[PDB]
């Protein structure tokens, strides 16, 4: 079970990369449940897009604290972090990203 | 005014190039320009002594 | 019934206010003629590298009606825009063929005015 | 001293650009950037209604006709204060377009800042425009001022 910790601007994501089907739960809740304006929905997949990991790990989440804009952006980090503790064969490509701004 | 000598067959600025160099040799820069306003005789006497001594210019 | 002058001589006087760019004939007759206050310029651009351009260049063009082919340079007096005015004068197509060692260098003469602080 | 950087954030699903995103950081007041997002995009959903074309083409032409090639910037050599015209980046043109955009839309005045965007998109990529008048007078001093060129 990977996991990983998408510390943003107080909103932390508590994310365990485990083997699924491509799932997103967000404090017990469907993308589209918990979150709106689905602009944000592309982008959290930005790191998921640049190495191909569609539909092979799930994502169980309790993301406590923060507004939707920096709940999202701790869900990528956190994502980004599990995915390189995962596998670091991508992190030549993902060092491009980082995410990290200690916001 | 460098000279009456003419040169061809080179570029626009390699002509600048030998006329801001032969212009020094010439009072275009000096006697032309020095009187543009009088200088009292003591102090135009005193100038020579200071400038092509000290070589300031 | 136009004298169709081959090559003339160009006067340029420049100055710290103003530029003056007259174009001539071997005898010195009056072919064309152009000048900084005639481009716009009123004030002390008057004086400038870009007005002395100018300037060059409208005298280049009106001379090109009247057909001289190639021309002397005569430049004289002091200032900056003496280098652009030549520039242009080139870049006008019509090829400088010569120039003088004239200047009007006194020996002695009379004494200037007094200066601007006193 | 010197220069510094910076960074901005490019995708966007609604006619994605740049030059959009920094369109959208722009317009945003009190933090609400949501405010100007969806401003945005219900005033290029407006443009491709009432225009059968991409809102990409038009913005584009847009910008390309705001853009200003020459700035004129001010300076006191002496009691006579100056000015020299000057080439402006490319980047500086694509803000100072951003800015003149923005500012003669919200004076226009109209129902909603939406109609108010498109008709001055609309107004930019057909030449005669708010902001044009100001690209005009901006090229109309960096010509009168052409004296100085260059110091």
């Known amino acids: 079970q990977y996991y990983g910790t998408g510390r943003r601007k107080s909103s932390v994501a508590r994310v365990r990369l485990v083997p699924g089907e491509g799932r997103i739960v967000v404090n017990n809740r469907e993308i589209s449940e918990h979150i709106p304006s689905a602009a944000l929905i592309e982008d959290i997949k930005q790191p998921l897009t640049l190495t191909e990991t569609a539909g092979t790990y799930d994502v169980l989440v309790n993301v406590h604290g923060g507004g939707l804009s920096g709940q999202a952006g701790a869900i990528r980090h956190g994502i980004a972090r599990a995915l390189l503790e995962a596998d670091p064969e991508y992190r030549t490509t993902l060092k491009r990203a980082g995410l990290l701004t200690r916001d | 005014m460098s000279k009456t000598v003419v040169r061809k067959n080179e570029s626009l600025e390699d002509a600048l190039r030998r006329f801001k160099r032969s212009v020094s040799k010439t009072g275009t820069l000096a006697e032309a320009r020095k009187r543009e306003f009088y200088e009292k005789p003591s102090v135009k006497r005193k100038k020579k002594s200071e400038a092509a001594r000290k070589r300031k210019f | 019934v136009k004298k169709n002058i081959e090559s003339g001589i160009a006067h340029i006087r420049s100055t710290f206010n103003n530029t003056i760019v007259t174009i001539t004939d071997t005898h010195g007759n009056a072919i064309s003629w152009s000048s900084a206050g005639a481009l716009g310029f009123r004030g002390s651009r008057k004086s400038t590298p870009f007005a002395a351009q100018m300037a060059a260049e409208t005298a280049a063009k009106g001379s090109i009606e009247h057909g001289l082919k190639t021309l002397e340079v005569t430049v004289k007096g002091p200032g900056s825009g003496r280098e652009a005015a030549i520039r242009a004068l080139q870049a006008a197509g019509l090829e400088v063929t010569a120039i003088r060692d004239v200047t009007p260098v006194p020996h002695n003469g009379c004494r200037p005015p007094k200066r601007r602080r006193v | ?151």
Do not use: C
Request: proline share 4%; hydrophobic share 40%.
């Open chain 4, 1 to 151: 001293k010197g220069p510094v950087a910076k960074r901005d954030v490019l995708p966007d699903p609604i006619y994605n650009s740049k030059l959009v995103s920094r369109l959208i950081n722009k317009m945003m007041i009190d933090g609400k950037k949501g405010k100007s997002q969806t401003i945005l995009y219900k005033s290029f959903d407006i443009i491709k209604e009432r225009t059968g074309n991409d809102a990409m083409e038009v913005f584009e032409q847009a910008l390309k006709n705001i853009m200003p090639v020459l700035e004129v910037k001010a300076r006191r050599v002496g009691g006579a204060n100056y000015q020299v015209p000057v080439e402006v980046r490319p980047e500086r043109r694509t803000t100072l377009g951003l800015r003149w955009l923005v500012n003669y839309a919200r004076l226009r005045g109209e129902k909603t800042m939406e109609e108010r965007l498109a008709n001055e998109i609309l107004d930019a990529a057909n030449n005669t425009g708010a902001a044009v008048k100001k690209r005009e007078d901006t090229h109309k001093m960096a010509e009168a001022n052409k004296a100085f060129a260059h110091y």
